[PDB]
Amino acid sequence: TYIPMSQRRSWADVKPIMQDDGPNPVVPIMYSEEYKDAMDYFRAIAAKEEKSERALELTEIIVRMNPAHYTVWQYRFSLLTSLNKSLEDELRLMNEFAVQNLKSYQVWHHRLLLLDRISPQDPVSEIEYIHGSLLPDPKNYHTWAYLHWLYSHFSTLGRISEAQWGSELDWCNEMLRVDGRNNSAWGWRWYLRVSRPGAETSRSLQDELIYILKSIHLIPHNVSAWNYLRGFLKHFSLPLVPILPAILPYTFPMPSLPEDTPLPVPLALEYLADSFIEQNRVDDAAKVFEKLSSEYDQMRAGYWEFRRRECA
Amino acid sequence: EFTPSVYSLVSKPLPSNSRPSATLDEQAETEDLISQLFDLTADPNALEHGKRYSGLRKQEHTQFLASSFFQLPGKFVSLDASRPWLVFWTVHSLDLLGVALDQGTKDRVVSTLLHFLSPKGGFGGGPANSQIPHLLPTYASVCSLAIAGNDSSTGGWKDLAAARQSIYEFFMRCKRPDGGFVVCEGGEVDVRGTYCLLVVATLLDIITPELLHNVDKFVSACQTYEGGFACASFPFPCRVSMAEAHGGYTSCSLNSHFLLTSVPLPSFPLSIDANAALRWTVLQQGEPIEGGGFRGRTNKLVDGCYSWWVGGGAPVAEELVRREKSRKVIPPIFNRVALQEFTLVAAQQDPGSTGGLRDKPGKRPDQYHTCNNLSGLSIAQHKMSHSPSTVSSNRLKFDASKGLPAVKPVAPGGGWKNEDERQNARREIWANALGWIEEEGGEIIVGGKDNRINTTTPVFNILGLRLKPFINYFYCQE
Amino acid sequence: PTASACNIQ
Ligand SMILES: CC(C)=CCC/C(C)=C/CC/C(C)=C/CSP(=O)(O)OP(=O)(O)O
Ligand SMILES: O=S(=O)(O)C[C@@H](O)CNC1CCCCC1
Ligand SMILES: O=S(=O)(O)C[C@@H](O)CNC1CCCCC1
Ligand SMILES: [Zn+2]
C-alpha cells in the first residue's frame, strides 16, 4: 500500500506544488497516485533548488516511472555533482536501467555525461560493457552512436592504444561474421578503417577492397556491402573499371554462385552503369539505367529514368 | 509509367544467397506479414468479392484521435515529457484529414501549450512549473499554435511574438561552438535539435549570424558514406559522422540544410552531397513484397513513420539536386503510388476497430504513426516543388518597413552587419519559406478522390494554409 | 497487438 509523501516525516517540511496545467488542458494524462505525488514534491524541490539525498532519491523514483523525463534527469545529474556522489556507483545503477530502457535518449546521454566526468585513463571496461550490451540488440542506434563518441572522445585524450584499436576491429569483424547484413557494424567498420583520424591509409586500401569484395561474394544481395563498396571507391577517388570483372557476373576476389541468388542484382547494374559513365560511354550507361527502370528494379522506375536522362 | 503499383509487380522475398542471419530472419517474417495483407486486400487501383476494401478510413482515424485527445490512461506517463508532440500529432493529423476543431477546442489547445512556455524562453514537454524548455517541445508547440491558434488576444500568436527575445536567448544558451545545439540544459546534441530550432527561428523571424555559426558544418559532417545523415558529428582537434545514415536524422539534416540555404551569409551554408542524399532516400523504399513502404536504415524493417521522415525528404533532396545541376550549367523520383498503397493497405488499422495508423501489421496504431503515415501520404499524393518564380513573386511583394522588433544578440557584433543586410535576410528567409507550391496536375490519388488528404509543406510539415498566415504574422506581411 | 518503439524524444 502506497504511503503518501504528505504522511512521511522525512518530507513534513516540504509543501508540495500542483502541476500548473491551466484550465481544462488537452491531452491530459491520468497520472497514477505514485507519479502525481512524486511530481508534486519534485516541483517543490526543484523550485527551491534543494540539493539533498532525499531529492536524489526522489529523482530515481521518478525516472523509473518515466525514463524519458529529461527535466528530472537534468536535475539528477546536478545532484550527483553537488552532493559529490560516487559516479562509479551511478554508472552501475545505469547498467540496470540500460537493460530495459535501450532506446531512452536520456539514459544514454546521462551515461555519456558520467564517463566524460569520470574520465578514466583506460575506458576498456566501459567499451566491453557496450559490446556486451549489443548482443541482445545488435542494431541499437543509441548504443552505436555512443560507442562512436566513446572512442572519439577518449582518442583525443590519447588514451586509446594501438592494441585497443586492433581488438576493436577484431570485434567488428566478428560482428559482421555473425550477421553480414548488420548495417550498424558496417558503419563501425567505416569509422575504424576510414573516417577515424588514426585510420591506416596506405596496401591498406587494397586489403579493404579484398574484404569488401569477399563480403559481396558471400552475400551478393547485401545492400550494406554494396553501399560500403561504392562509398569506399568514392571516398578514395578510385576507378570502378579495374574492379568491374568482380561485379560483372552479377549483371581481386571473384564470385563463385551461391544457391538462391537471382540475377541480376540491381546494385550490380548501378555499378556497371556508373562504370560506363566513368568510361564516357553515356549511351551504354543509359541503356542499363533503362533496364533498371523497366525490368530489374521497377520500384525505382522514376529514379532510374532520372539517371537515364542525366546521360542524354 | 514510372510509378508502378505493388500489385502490378512481382513480389519475391529478399534472396538469402544461402547465408541466413538474424536480419534475414526478421525481414522474411515481416515480408510474409505484409504480403498476406496485400493478398487479402483489394487492389486500390482496380474497378474481388470478399477482399478487404483499402479506402482511407478517415472517420475511424478521427475517432482514434478524439479518444485520446481529451484524456489518456496512466500508462502514457512514458510520454509525459512529450505532450506537445501528442498535441501536434493530433491537430496536424486532423488538418490532413480535413477535420475542423471548433473554436472552443482550439482555445483549449492554445491554453495548454501557453502553459508550457517558460518566461526564460522556450516550451517544455509540460507546464513550466514542471519541466524545463526543450528544443523538440518548442517545435511541436510552435507548429501546433500555427495550426490551432490565431491573432486574437486568446489566439496565442501574440504570446509567441512577445516571447521572441526570450526564445532566442534560449536558443543561444543551447548553442555549442562546434555548430550543434543541446536539446535542453545539459541535454544531448544531435540534428533533431538543429532542425527544430531552425524551423522555429525561421517562422518567428529570430535568425541572426551568431545563431547560425558552424551550424552548417555540423550538419554537413553528419552525412555518411551511404548518402544519408547520422544523428551527429564529432569535431577532432576534421568532423566525423557518429553513426548510420538514418531516416529520422536524414530528414532533420536535409530540412535543416534547406532552411539554411535561404540565409544570405557568405560561403554559407557548407554544401552537402545532394545526389548521394537522393540516392540513399530512394534506396530506402521497400520492395513490392514489403508494400513499398520506406525503411529507416539499410537492412532494417519498413516502418510507416518513415513515409514522412524519408519520403518527406525526397522533394527536398530533389530540389537540392536540381540546384546543384544548375550550378554547373519530369517523372517522380520515388514510387508515389506504392507508398500510398502501403499506407492504405498495410498502415491502416484493420477496419471496424479502433482506427489510427501504425508502423506495420502486428503493431498497435498510435498518435505518432498516425501523424507520420498521413504526412507521408500527403507528400506522395501531392507533387510539392520549391518554385523560384514563386520566391521571386514573394520578393516583389515583401514590405521591409513592416516587422517585429529585431532580436538583441548576446554578443555585440553577433547581429546583422546593418539594417540593410538584416532586411535582405528577412526577405530571403521569408520568401523561401513560402516558396513551396503544389504542381497543378501533379496530383496522384490512389483509390480515388475520397482518399485525398490535404497538402502538407515539405521541411515544416504543416499545411500551407497554416504556414502562410502564421509566418506572415511574425514578419508582418499579412 | 504489440506496441511500437519509435522514440523521437
Ligand atoms: C524530428 C524529430 C524530433 C525526430 C525524428 C527523428 C527520428 C525518427 C529519430 C530516431 C533515431 C533513432 C535512435 C531510431 C532508432 S528507433 P528503431 O531502431 O526501433 O527504428 P528502426 O529499426 O531504425 O526502423
Ligand atoms: O468512414 S470509415 O472508413 O472510417 C468507417 C465508417 O464510418 C463506418 N460507418 C458505416 C457507414 C454508416 C453506417 C454504419 C457503417
Ligand atoms: O475518384 S473518383 O472521384 O472519380 C470517385 C470516388 O471518390 C469514389 N469513392 C468510392 C465510392 C463511394 C464509396 C467510397 C469509395
Ligand atoms: Zn515507426
Side-chain angles (χ1 to χ4, degrees):
Chain A
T1 306
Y2 179 71
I3 305 173
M5 298 180 66
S6 68
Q7 301 177 7
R8 310 219 282 255
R9 295 181 177 180
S10 296
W11 293 92
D13 66 277
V14 178
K15 186 178 187 298
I17 297 177
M18 303 302 101
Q19 185 160 315
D20 186 26
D21 301 285
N24 202 222
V26 300
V27 73
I29 305 175
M30 306 294 89
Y31 305 121
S32 72
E33 180 181 15
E34 295 79 10
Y35 188 82
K36 173 185 186 299
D37 195 25
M39 284 299 298
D40 284 344
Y41 280 84
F42 174 79
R43 285 175 200 103
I45 287 298
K48 62 192 297 293
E49 291 180 291
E50 176 181 310
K51 306 295 169 48
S52 64
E53 294 290 345
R54 68 175 177 184
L56 179 60
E57 296 176 6
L58 183 56
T59 59
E60 177 179 349
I61 289 298
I62 298 176
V63 295
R64 286 187 180 275
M65 287 181 291
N66 178 17
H69 210 329
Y70 64 89
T71 293
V72 179
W73 282 107
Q74 192 282 326
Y75 204 78
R76 174 167 191 92
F77 190 82
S78 72
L79 287 172
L80 298 175
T81 293
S82 183
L83 297 169
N84 195 78
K85 301 290 294 185
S86 170
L87 301 184
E88 293 78 16
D89 291 343
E90 174 79 355
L91 191 59
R92 274 181 283 276
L93 185 66
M94 287 308 95
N95 292 346
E96 181 202 340
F97 267 88
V99 175
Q100 318 154 25
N101 309 282
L102 287 166
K103 283 170 278 297
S104 175
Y105 282 95
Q106 290 71 38
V107 175
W108 285 107
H109 186 66
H110 191 66
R111 192 180 193 99
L112 182 152
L113 294 177
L114 291 171
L115 261 106
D116 175 79
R117 194 174 183 88
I118 297 175
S119 190
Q121 290 295 322
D122 197 327
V124 59
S125 70
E126 173 69 357
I127 293 176
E128 292 173 344
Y129 169 84
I130 294 303
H131 285 169
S133 173
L134 283 168
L135 268 49
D137 191 350
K139 301 188 180 193
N140 192 279
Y141 197 93
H142 292 129
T143 310
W144 286 105
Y146 178 76
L147 184 57
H148 283 250
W149 171 88
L150 193 62
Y151 265 100
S152 297
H153 175 74
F154 286 98
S155 75
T156 68
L157 300 175
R159 300 183 186 174
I160 305 300
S161 68
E162 288 308 311
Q164 186 63 44
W165 286 119
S167 69
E168 192 59 33
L169 181 60
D170 287 340
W171 179 81
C172 189
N173 283 335
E174 182 59 32
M175 289 296 289
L176 282 174
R177 191 194 65 77
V178 168
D179 189 351
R181 300 179 182 94
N182 187 343
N183 195 249
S184 303
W186 281 99
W188 188 225
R189 183 184 180 85
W190 181 274
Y191 173 94
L192 294 172
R193 298 290 287 99
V194 176
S195 71
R196 68 181 263 253
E200 228 297 337
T201 58
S202 77
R203 298 183 182 180
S204 200
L205 298 184
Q206 193 172 357
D207 294 328
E208 191 69 7
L209 277 175
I210 302 176
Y211 182 93
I212 304 179
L213 272 48
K214 291 173 65 178
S215 296
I216 291 184
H217 299 141
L218 241 187
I219 314 178
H221 288 262
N222 183 19
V223 181
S224 286
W226 287 97
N227 284 341
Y228 196 99
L229 175 66
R230 297 312 306 271
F232 181 84
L233 295 176
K234 182 175 182 176
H235 180 73
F236 298 105
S237 301
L238 299 167
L240 281 57
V241 172
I243 303 78
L244 186 61
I247 294 74
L248 205 56
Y250 302 116
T251 69
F252 298 116
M254 291 284 173
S256 304
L257 278 187
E259 205 78 30
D260 190 20
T261 306
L263 297 179
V265 189
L267 290 179
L269 293 179
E270 183 197 41
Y271 189 98
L272 174 63
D274 292 332
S275 290
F276 288 147
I277 294 295
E278 176 177 294
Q279 292 177 326
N280 293 319
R281 302 169 66 180
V282 300
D283 292 342
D284 289 331
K287 290 183 178 182
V288 39
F289 282 134
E290 191 280 336
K291 279 292 182 297
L292 282 163
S293 173
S294 298
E295 301 182 21
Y296 303 114
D297 195 31
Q298 303 178 55
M299 176 63 62
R300 288 157 204 89
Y303 174 73
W304 296 127
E305 166 66 10
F306 163 75
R307 299 278 267 114
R308 168 192 160 273
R309 293 185 184 179
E310 196 66 9
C311 299
Chain B
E1 242 193 12
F2 306 106
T3 55
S5 156
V6 173
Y7 289 93
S8 69
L9 296 179
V10 184
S11 290
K12 67 184 247 293
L14 182 65
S16 67
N17 298 322
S18 297
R19 183 158 188 88
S21 71
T23 298
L24 194 61
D25 290 334
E26 290 199 28
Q27 174 65 15
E29 194 166 17
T30 294
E31 286 172 339
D32 289 12
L33 221 47
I34 301 172
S35 292
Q36 293 169 4
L37 196 44
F38 269 78
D39 291 332
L40 271 49
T41 302
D43 173 10
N45 307 280
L47 288 172
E48 182 180 344
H49 295 332
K51 298 286 189 177
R52 183 176 300 179
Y53 181 58
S54 72
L56 188 63
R57 298 177 279 277
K58 312 182 68 170
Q59 300 189 13
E60 293 189 2
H61 301 324
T62 297
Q63 296 168 342
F64 178 79
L65 298 171
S67 299
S68 299
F69 193 52
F70 307 109
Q71 180 173 121
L72 295 169
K75 59 186 295 182
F76 276 81
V77 66
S78 66
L79 291 172
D80 191 35
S82 293
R83 288 178 58 234
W85 282 113
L86 289 167
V87 175
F88 175 76
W89 295 329
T90 294
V91 297
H92 184 48
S93 288
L94 291 175
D95 260 13
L96 292 171
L97 289 174
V99 176
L101 290 176
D102 61 31
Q103 191 54 245
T105 303
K106 292 187 181 179
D107 291 345
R108 290 182 55 190
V109 174
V110 174
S111 177
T112 302
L113 295 171
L114 291 184
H115 279 82
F116 298 171
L117 181 57
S118 288
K120 302 284 188 173
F123 294 82
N129 82 339
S130 307
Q131 309 187 215
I132 61 179
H134 188 117
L135 294 180
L136 276 51
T138 292
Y139 163 91
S141 294
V142 165
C143 288
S144 295
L145 281 166
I147 297 172
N150 62 72
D151 63 14
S152 80
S153 62
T154 59
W157 295 3
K158 163 187 66 66
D159 305 80
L160 275 180
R164 282 172 65 254
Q165 178 63 216
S166 63
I167 291 175
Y168 176 82
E169 291 165 347
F170 169 57
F171 286 172
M172 286 303 296
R173 288 195 295 273
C174 296
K175 184 181 180 60
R176 293 300 92 110
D178 74 328
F181 294 95
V182 293
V183 293
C184 64
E185 182 178 7
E188 66 273 25
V189 177
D190 58 66
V191 289
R192 294 173 309 141
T194 302
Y195 164 75
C196 292
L197 182 155
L198 289 174
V199 166
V200 173
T202 294
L203 294 176
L204 304 183
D205 184 22
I206 60 179
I207 287 180
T208 70
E210 72 171 7
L211 182 67
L212 300 186
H213 183 76
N214 282 164
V215 170
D216 58 323
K217 301 180 179 182
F218 180 94
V219 169
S220 299
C222 287
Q223 193 167 207
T224 78
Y225 70 90
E226 283 198 287
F229 295 73
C231 58
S233 57
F234 188 95
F236 284 103
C238 70
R239 302 164 179 267
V240 179
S241 56
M242 294 283 78
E244 287 168 277
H246 192 260
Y249 300 117
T250 297
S251 172
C252 295
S253 293
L254 285 173
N255 293 336
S256 286
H257 182 78
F258 190 89
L259 286 168
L260 295 175
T261 67
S262 60
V263 184
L265 289 169
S267 301
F268 185 93
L270 186 62
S271 67
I272 64 173
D273 193 334
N275 287 276
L278 177 60
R279 177 182 175 272
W280 182 93
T281 294
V282 306
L283 283 179
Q284 303 325 130
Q285 184 156 207
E287 300 297 324
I289 192 170
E290 52 197 350
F294 283 94
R295 68 185 90 254
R297 273 184 286 167
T298 302
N299 273 131
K300 294 274 284 170
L301 304 176
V302 296
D303 185 325
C305 67
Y306 299 118
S307 294
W308 168 248
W309 304 120
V310 181
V316 176
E318 180 183 342
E319 169 65 9
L320 292 174
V321 167
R322 188 196 67 80
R323 295 178 179 181
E324 195 166 275
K325 181 176 182 178
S326 296
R327 211 194 83 94
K328 295 206 301 295
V329 176
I330 185 175
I333 216 57
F334 71 99
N335 196 337
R336 302 172 53 191
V337 164
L339 186 61
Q340 293 181 229
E341 285 172 337
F342 181 90
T343 314
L344 296 173
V345 177
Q348 291 195 283
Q349 171 65 293
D350 304 320
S353 193
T354 67
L357 293 88
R358 63 199 172 183
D359 156 23
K360 280 184 300 290
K363 312 304 285 291
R364 297 188 184 190
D366 58 51
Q367 297 87 338
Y368 163 81
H369 283 99
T370 293
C371 175
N372 287 287
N373 274 101
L374 294 172
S375 299
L377 176 59
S378 180
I379 292 297
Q381 282 187 356
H382 308 283
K383 186 71 172 183
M384 300 306 284
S385 289
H386 199 260
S387 175
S389 56
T390 294
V391 174
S392 290
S393 175
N394 291 337
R395 289 192 182 100
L396 291 180
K397 70 178 64 176
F398 185 77
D399 188 334
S401 72
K402 305 284 280 70
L404 306 177
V407 292
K408 182 185 64 178
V410 176
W416 296 100
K417 166 181 164 59
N418 55 28
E419 185 68 5
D420 285 312
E421 293 195 7
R422 174 179 167 258
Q423 296 302 161
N424 178 63
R426 251 170 40 92
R427 191 211 307 178
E428 284 300 319
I429 298 168
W430 174 86
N432 283 275
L434 292 177
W436 293 99
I437 68 173
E438 180 181 3
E439 292 196 15
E440 294 178 337
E443 209 180 50
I444 305 175
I445 318 299
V446 178
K449 295 187 174 185
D450 282 323
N451 287 340
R452 192 203 104 100
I453 57 174
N454 292 127
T455 307
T456 197
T457 313
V459 180
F460 300 99
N461 198 20
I462 59 177
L463 301 194
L465 65 85
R466 299 300 193 200
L467 172 57
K468 175 169 291 182
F470 192 70
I471 199 173
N472 278 352
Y473 174 84
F474 298 100
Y475 283 79
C476 299
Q477 305 295 132
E478 300 171 289
Chain C
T2 180
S4 194
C6 293
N7 296 329
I8 73 173
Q9 185 181 309

